[PDB]
Amino acid sequence: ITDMAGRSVVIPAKVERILLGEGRLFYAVSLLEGQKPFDRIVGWQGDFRKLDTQTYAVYKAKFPQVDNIPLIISPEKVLTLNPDIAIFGLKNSELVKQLEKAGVPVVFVDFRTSPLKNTLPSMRVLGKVLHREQQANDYIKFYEDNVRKVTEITSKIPADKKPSVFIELRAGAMEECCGTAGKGNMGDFIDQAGGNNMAKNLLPGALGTVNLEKVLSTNPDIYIASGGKAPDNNAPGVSLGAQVTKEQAQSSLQTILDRKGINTLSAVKNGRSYGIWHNFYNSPYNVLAIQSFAKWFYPQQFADLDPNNTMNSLYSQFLAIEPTGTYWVDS
Numbered sequence: 001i002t003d004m005a006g007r008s009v010v011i012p013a014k015v016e017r018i019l020l021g022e023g024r025l026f027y028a029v030s031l032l033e034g035q036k037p038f039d040r041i042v043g044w045q046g047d048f049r050k051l052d053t054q055t056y057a058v059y060k061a062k063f064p065q066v067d068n069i070p071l072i073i074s075p076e077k078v079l080t081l082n083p084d085i086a087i088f089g090l091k092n093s094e095l096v097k098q099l100e101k102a103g104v105p106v107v108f109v110d111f112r113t114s115p116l117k118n119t120l121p122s123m124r125v126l127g128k129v130l131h132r133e134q135q136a137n138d139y140i141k142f143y144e145d146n147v148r149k150v151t152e153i154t155s156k157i158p159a160d161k162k163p164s165v166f167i168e169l170r171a172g173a174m175e176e177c178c179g180t181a182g183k184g185n186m187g188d189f190i191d192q193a194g195g196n197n198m199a200k201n202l203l204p205g206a207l208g209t210v211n212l213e214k215v216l217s218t219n220p221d222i223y224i225a226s227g228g229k230a231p232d233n234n235a236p237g238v239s240l241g242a243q244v245t246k247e248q249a250q251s252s253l254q255t256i257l258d259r260k261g262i263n264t265l266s267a268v269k270n271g272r273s274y275g276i277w278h279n280f281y282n283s284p285y286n287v288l289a290i291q292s293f294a295k296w297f298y299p300q301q302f303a304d305l306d307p308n309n310t311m312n313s314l315y316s317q318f319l320a321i322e323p324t325g326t327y328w329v330d331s
């Protein structure tokens, strides 16, 4: 193996005990664990349980054991869990040092900073080091095919024909507005879906913030807000995920679109304004976002493309729960 930090690592002999240093790495692991999702997970960081309460609650009702997975508990205690392997994303510098001095192998994967470069390499690696190469090679082919449906068209489109796009990540509460993605993160999706991300040249990094005045002045063709907020939660933000209905999503999206300034945007007035589930920013399920983006960017060329079909297929083929809720929405 060569991991996403360029480190060389040795495939364990056996793996029955996996440590998830970033909780949302569960999403990648879920694609390899078939009907037994939590069986080999001895502990995890609590971002999956605390930030994706919706997906979690759906997993709990079919697997109540999940509440007893330890949350990364002193570092020392976690070493007692005797992990065969620890997976981390590109704060956890101490936990990593201890694990390495315990002769535990550590793998760094990535689906957040450089998703285009790394989503599939990340899956290929997890395939090998977790003894699930077929399920990985399967998801990879399924991902590639569902992305080719888009790139076959968008790869050939010249820059001057492409719509301008601004994506506001975690839109909501705009005393602090215009958090977005630049040369990476969801900008990779915009790139692949044949969009022109207005923030690509404003930002040095994958993630960052932009001034509202800069969005108003560019006045992009397309506006996207991301969110993963539960419906019953009067906090501001777009409400999407496994327990959100179409009607809850539109209602919450509309609240976001009606903020001072944002509501004057041409893209808002022309109804080229959309919502995407935030967690696609760190997940190999991101193919769904790429497809949602293409469909928004070029509605007719992708008229028959339905991300809901791809999602139902992904769940059918790889997961152990039923798809529910709303992961994207239109004005």
Ligand SMILES: [Fe+3]
Pocket (backbone or CB within 6 Å): none
């Ligand atoms: Fe985040």
